[PDB]
Design a protein around this ligand. Sequence first.
Ligand code: NA
Ligand code: NA
Lengths: 314, 314
Amino acid sequence: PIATPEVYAEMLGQAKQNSYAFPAINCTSSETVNAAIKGFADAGSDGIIQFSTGGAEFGSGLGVKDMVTGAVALAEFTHVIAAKYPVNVALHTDHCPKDKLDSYVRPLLAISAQRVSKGGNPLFQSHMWDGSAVPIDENLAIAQELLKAAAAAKIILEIEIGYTSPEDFEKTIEALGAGEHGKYLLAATFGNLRPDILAQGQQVAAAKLGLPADAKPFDFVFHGGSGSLKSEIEEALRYGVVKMNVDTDTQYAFTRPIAGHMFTNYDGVLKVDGEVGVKKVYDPRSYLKKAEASMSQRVVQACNDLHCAGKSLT
Amino acid sequence: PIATPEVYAEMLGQAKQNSYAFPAINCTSSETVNAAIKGFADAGSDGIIQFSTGGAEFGSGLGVKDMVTGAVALAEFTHVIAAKYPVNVALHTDHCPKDKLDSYVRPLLAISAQRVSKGGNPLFQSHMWDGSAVPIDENLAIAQELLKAAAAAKIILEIEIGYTSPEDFEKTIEALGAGEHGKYLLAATFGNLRPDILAQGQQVAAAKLGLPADAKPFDFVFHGGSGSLKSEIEEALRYGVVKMNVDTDTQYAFTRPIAGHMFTNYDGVLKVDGEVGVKKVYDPRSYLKKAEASMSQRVVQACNDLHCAGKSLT
Ligand code: NA
Ligand code: NA
């Protein structure tokens, strides 16, 4: 099943507490969605699927080029497929800069807010506001009003600040609270390395809130997950990193067999020397199955790398 | 938008009255569904997308392998997307044999039956029963109960009988009627070529019903529509072919640009000689946009060849 807001939060809670993180796979089609979910399930693990603005535009198709239709289209498809797997999958929307709030995140927020007022769950379980490229102040201002929308729509907001400053973590707590006005995830800039910036950010916020020095007020997000060194990732997990984006590596694992298929069956996927090709290899499923299954093998590898393998709530 | 049953019958009606037919494009994923619809709207045509048992199993993913899940999932996807287009798009399932009636055709009829008792429309507008491999007597007995169920979900039923003899057309009329028991499409055997077999079935049929000689009681479908001849097609259209399945040709169009992309961008989709590849060209979207546009062009061609281009009812 797709994750309800309650299991999503339980998912993030249980990961924060036992120091593992969820892989969040960017997907741009039913094939790749299917590969990610199959990967998670295979690693007896819950997981997260995300739609980037680019990937959602691609999803609405070349004749539509509309992120919101793209996202909703894909999510609807994902709801039907999720139901047939035992693990829980959270739908998330990825990097959305300021100039795209009115045509991506705000529209989607209104869609879920509408579903929630009818007594249903929201379409997506989290959305990212990316204000990394504007003054931390202006970022937190906007973050504030999006957080009220998100929380109303039972959705977790993710935000990105800015090496991030100790004063930045303070400003963030001041502005957003630490969950009482809506749960939210934090992506800080620590060399994406310097994972100890995150450890520092956690004490700093604990001091300010008046909690024990071991308390972890933030749930962190790790951008720059692909191509990474186990040691650094292990350390980051201890400091409360709960979600790690994997995009580039699941792309290569997905394309690599297609490439292979094309070369080895060159004179069968192409009509060469007056011949008519071999239909069993230019059938998209012949290589798209290889692609999907290759992406599921990589996705499994990530659930082992973030130790969420085998830890599915269900 | 998706064709309601009313518009769907209105489409086929007009196509019969004016001797054109619609391409019915086989689809297996979100990319192919977007290509097909974009093709129709470029061609200014209404159109048909259909999911075979094999592609619908492919749509549910390597980790579910279930026809019904894949048909529903891909169908909810198409409902969202078709809403953005001004042409009517009907959803059809393809070739379903006796031993797959229970795991494909019937549970889908059930889903739409429930949907229609609540005030709305069926999920699909037409469903195929392929009994070509059983004796016409048994073929038609099963057709009769399916047609009861199909007409109750406001659904058009397609059937295949078996060269089809004058006697088989008479039987078919005797068992199903000519519309008073709900509407159905007929695929007959005639070398798929001898399109004159179809004219014969129209005469035979028209005579049994005391309708005009030149009547056209049957709505015929044309399987084996790829690698066909542009004069075979014209004749068939005169005799009431309203729907021609294209699969092989749109498959090759999809795969062709993917293959070329891999070969030309070889040292970018592979990591070769210590290099790390180019992310711009092993990003799945890069070459699936090509594939999708190529497939759309083939669809515009089929629309042109079948004379449904520019004849959308909206
Ligand atoms: Na069928
Ligand atoms: Na068919």
